[PDB]
Amino acid sequence: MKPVKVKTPAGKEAELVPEKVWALAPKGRKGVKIGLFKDPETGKYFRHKLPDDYPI
DNA sequence: GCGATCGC
DNA sequence: GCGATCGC
Structure with missing residues (x-):
């Protein structure tokens, strides 16, 4: 699965x-x-919208 | 609230 | 069983 540019709950932009x-x-x-993503730095799980064309 | 999902 | 995710 391809990385997604997201903002983490900590407030940082990351491709995850x-x-x-x-x-x-x-x-x-x-x-x-x-x-469903995991913040690479805090370990905190969070959800985030994906691009509309993202493969499910 | 709907829709699914899962960490908590 | 609830919160949190978007856009109605």
Whole structure:
């Protein structure tokens, strides 16, 4: 899986590979894609939106 | 609240 | 079982 440019909860921009990705959309609607990331410095897990074209 | 996911 | 993730 490709790295994603995200802002971490610590407030830093990092290109990180997500541990898990999935589509989050109500039925019949466009939604978003979410990834689960781990902050490389604090170990804290966080979710973040993925680009709309990111492979699920 | 909906939608899924999972760390806590 | 809740918070947190987006955009309605």
